[PDB]
Amino acid sequence: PISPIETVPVKLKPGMDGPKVKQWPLTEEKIKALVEICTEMEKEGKISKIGPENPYNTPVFAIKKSTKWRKLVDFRELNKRTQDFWEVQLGIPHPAGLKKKKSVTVLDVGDAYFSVPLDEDFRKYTAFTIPSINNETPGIRYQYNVLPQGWKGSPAIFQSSMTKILEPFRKQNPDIVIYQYMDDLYVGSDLEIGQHRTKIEELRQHLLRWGLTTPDKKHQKEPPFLWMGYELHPDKWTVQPIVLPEKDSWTVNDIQKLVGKLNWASQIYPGIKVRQLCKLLRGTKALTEVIPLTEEAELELAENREILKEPVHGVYYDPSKDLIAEIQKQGQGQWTYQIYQEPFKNLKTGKYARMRGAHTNDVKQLTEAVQKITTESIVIWGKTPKFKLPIQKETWETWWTEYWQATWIPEWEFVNTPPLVKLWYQLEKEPIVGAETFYVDGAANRETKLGKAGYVTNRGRQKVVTLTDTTNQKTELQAIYLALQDSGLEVNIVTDSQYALGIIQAQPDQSESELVNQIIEQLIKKEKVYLAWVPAHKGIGGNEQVDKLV
């Protein structure tokens, strides 16, 4: 049937006319197949022959799907000339946001697109031509009256058509849930299996009255449903079975597919790690090339196989209870988390491992992870969780009151699950009396890429090392590193590098720079470090005379 639903008006893009692609001549067998396929569609109202007036055309082909034939219309040029539509849906419901359901059935709309009418004023643009044998005769010329398969507006117009049809039934049955995905309807309720398969029949009847056929009770599926990679049960959910291939040799392509399934398992299996497996994909190799697994990559693979040994399931969402989110750091900038309402029945898990910056510390990373769990919460549940974080209330305040960027993480509580988050050093707020003062300076010749780094102190020491393949930024950090090697456990350091001051004041505990990591190692051993910035080239004390040397 074609349903009696009002049509959605459709326009070509402005300044453009409908397509006029020419029909390639087809084989006598495809022409015969197309004529059969077209006669039956024309009978049911899906298509209509048109006179020669219509000046538009789209190529049509036919391919052997067995012994049966499929009609393939190639809407590539009409699609390019059709207006844009609002898009079909902006996200997929995550299982962890679904509520518990006593009875669930999946309905499948038959011949979805061909059961919805096409805007009468737009049909002309869908004209196609079945060519004559060795292309002698004028062909037979049709146009669509329903949504064509493969045209740009089909998915959008179908799913809004389906939405206006369901909206009555939804109002008169507020506690029945129905999710539209392409030509599936997923239907859920808390009714008993008797009263539930009643209202499904009342729904099917309401769909038939709108020209939409469905399967009989014989074809409605039963839990556990496989869906979007998940395995939904009435009271729980998991990811569909994740199998880890035991191979002697791993290709790039094998490792990419393994990282994908581990990433996907990380939604409900806590503690999955992929860092060491992803390090192997760094670089440029063909998909077919074999990658030997490093020692750390094999230890990560082993620990993952351990996590996945027996199945884990998630529970669904009770709207009447708070969400708790816990974060643990796994090391190396890897974070993992669990969201539950009753400890410890997880609605879901995840991981965070972003290099946000070249240099950061665990406190900045923990905040970043809280921010991404918070956004995710809003999406899935419409509500932020209460956090349990492995950082002391006083470490956090100390950091965020001193730091120059603003922050605001929601209600949280400390939880003693080591490794705890700490700052590993802190710069003095005022110069250290009785400590040597180093006036450091770096310089690099942009032509040469050569550089000198050095210091001079108030005690009369002095030193200048030379550097190759370097930059002003690198020499200025080399200078600070020099002063920290040669200094004792207290030291004042005067630099004209706002670059270096910027980095070091943010208390990084990890960096992509081998240098910055060596400077950090040095800053932790010290007991006291004051670091000040003085304008370069203003003849300022020791700065002009360490500027000489470099």
Partner 1 sequence: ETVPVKLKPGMDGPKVKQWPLTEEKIKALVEICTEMEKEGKISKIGPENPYNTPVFAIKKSTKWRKLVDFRELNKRTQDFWEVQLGIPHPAGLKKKKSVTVLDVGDAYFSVPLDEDFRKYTAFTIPSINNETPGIRYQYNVLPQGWKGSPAIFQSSMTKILEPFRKQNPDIVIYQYMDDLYVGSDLEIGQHRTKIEELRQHLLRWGLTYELHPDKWTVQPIVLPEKDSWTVNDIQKLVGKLNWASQIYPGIKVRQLCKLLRGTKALTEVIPLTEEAELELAENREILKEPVHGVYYDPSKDLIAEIQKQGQGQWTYQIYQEPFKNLKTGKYARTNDVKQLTEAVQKITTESIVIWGKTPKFKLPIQKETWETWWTEYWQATWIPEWEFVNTPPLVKLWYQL
Annotated binding-site members for Mg(2+): 108, 183-184, 441, 476, 496, 547
- Indicate whether 234 belongs to the interface with ligand ZJ2 (CB under 6 A): yes
Phi, psi of 34 (to 5 degrees): -60, -35
Distance CA 412, CA 326 (A): 10
- Indicate whether 227 belongs to the interface with ligand ZJ2 (CB under 6 A): yes
Nearest in space to 22 (alpha carbons), one of 133, 143, 139, 122: 139
Nearest in space to 121 (alpha carbons), one of 273, 264, 7: 7
- Indicate whether 397 belongs to the interface with partner 1 (CB under 8 A): no
Phi, psi of 296 (to 5 degrees): -65, -35
Is 482:439 a contact under the CB 8 Å cutoff?
Answer: no
Binding residues: 108, 183-184, 441, 476, 496, 547
- Indicate whether 494 belongs to the interface with partner 1 (CB under 8 A): yes
Is 340:371 a contact under the CB 8 Å cutoff?
Answer: no
Select the binding partner of residue 534 from ligand ZJ2, partner 1, none (C-beta < 5 to 8 A, by kind). Answer: partner 1
Tokens 């009875």 belong to 103
Select the binding partner of residue 172 from partner 1, ligand ZJ2, none (C-beta < 5 to 8 A, by kind). Answer: none
Give the CA distances from residue 469 to residues 449, 473, 495, 529, in Å, rounded to whole numbers and listed in that order.
5, 12, 22, 29
Considering only 196, 199, 233, 388, the residue that binds ligand ZJ2 (CB under 6 A) is: 233
Tokens 């009978």 belong to 43
Q: Candidates 91-99, 129-137, 201-209, 517-525: pick the segment binding partner 1 (CB under 8 A).
A: 91-99
* Residues 248-307 close enough to bind partner 1 by CB under 8 A: none
Contact mark string toward partner 1, 461..480, x via CB under 8 A: --------------------
Tokens 């620990």 belong to 303
Q: Which two tokens stand for residue 62?
A: 């036919």
- Indicate whether 513 belongs to the interface with partner 1 (CB under 8 A): no
Considering only 77, 303, 368, 490, the residue that binds partner 1 (CB under 8 A) is: 368
- Between 175 and 430, whose beta carbon lies closer to ligand ZJ2? 175
- Indicate whether 162 belongs to the interface with ligand ZJ2 (CB under 6 A): no
Give residue 198's identity as a one-letter amino acid code.
Answer: T
Q: Which two tokens stand for residue 14?
A: 């402005």
Considering only 61, 69, 169, 179, the residue that binds ligand ZJ2 (CB under 6 A) is: 179
Is 192:102 a contact under the CB 8 Å cutoff?
Answer: yes
Considering only 254, 422, 533, 549, the residue that binds partner 1 (CB under 8 A) is: 533
Considering only 122, 144, 158, 186, the residue that binds ligand ZJ2 (CB under 6 A) is: 186
- Indicate whether 347 belongs to the interface with partner 1 (CB under 8 A): no
- Between 43 and 537, whose beta carbon lies closer to partner 1? 537
Q: Any idea of the CA torsion for 445, 446, 451, 455, to the nearest 10 degrees?
A: 80
* Residues 3-22 close enough to bind partner 1 by CB under 8 A: 8-11
- Indicate whether 71 belongs to the interface with ligand ZJ2 (CB under 6 A): no
Residue 347 C-beta: closest distance to ligand ZJ2, Å: 12
Select the binding partner of residue 480 from ligand ZJ2, partner 1, none (C-beta < 5 to 8 A, by kind). Answer: none
- Between 17 and 192, whose beta carbon lies closer to ligand ZJ2? 192
Nearest in space to 56 (alpha carbons), one of 111, 116, 11, 122: 122
- Between 99 and 548, whose beta carbon lies closer to ligand ZJ2? 99
463 half-sphere exposure, CB direction, 13 A CA radius:
18
- Indicate whether 430 belongs to the interface with partner 1 (CB under 8 A): yes
Q: What is the DSSP string of 289-349?
A: -EEPPPHHHHHHHHHHHHHTSS---B----TTS--EEEEEEEETTEEEEEEESSTT-EEEE
Can you tell me whether residue 376 is helix, strand or coil?
Answer: helix
Residues 6+ apart with CB under 8 A from 126: 56, 58, 78, 118, 143, 144, 148, 151
- Indicate whether 371 belongs to the interface with partner 1 (CB under 8 A): yes
Considering only 61, 69, 85, 225, the residue that binds ligand ZJ2 (CB under 6 A) is: 225
Considering only 104, 156, 207, 325, the residue that binds ligand ZJ2 (CB under 6 A) is: 104
- Indicate whether 314 belongs to the interface with ligand ZJ2 (CB under 6 A): no
- Indicate whether 98 belongs to the interface with ligand ZJ2 (CB under 6 A): yes
Distance CA 345, CA 348 (A): 9
Select the binding partner of residue 89 from partner 1, ligand ZJ2, none (C-beta < 5 to 8 A, by kind). Answer: partner 1
| Most distant pair of Cα atoms in the chain: their distance | 104
Give the CA distances from residue 258 to residues 17, 170, 297, 493, in Å, rounded to whole numbers and listed in that order.
48, 42, 12, 49
- Indicate whether 89 belongs to the interface with partner 1 (CB under 8 A): yes
Is 141:127 a contact under the CB 8 Å cutoff?
Answer: yes
Q: Which two tokens stand for residue 392?
A: 């002391």
Considering only 207, 380, 443, 523, the residue that binds partner 1 (CB under 8 A) is: 380
- Indicate whether 93 belongs to the interface with ligand ZJ2 (CB under 6 A): yes
Residue 81 C-beta: closest distance to ligand ZJ2, Å: 35
Considering only 73, 259, 278, 532, the residue that binds partner 1 (CB under 8 A) is: 532
Where does this chain bind ligand ZJ2 (CB under 6 A)?
A: 93, 98-99, 101, 104, 106, 177, 179, 186-188, 223, 225, 227, 232-234, 316
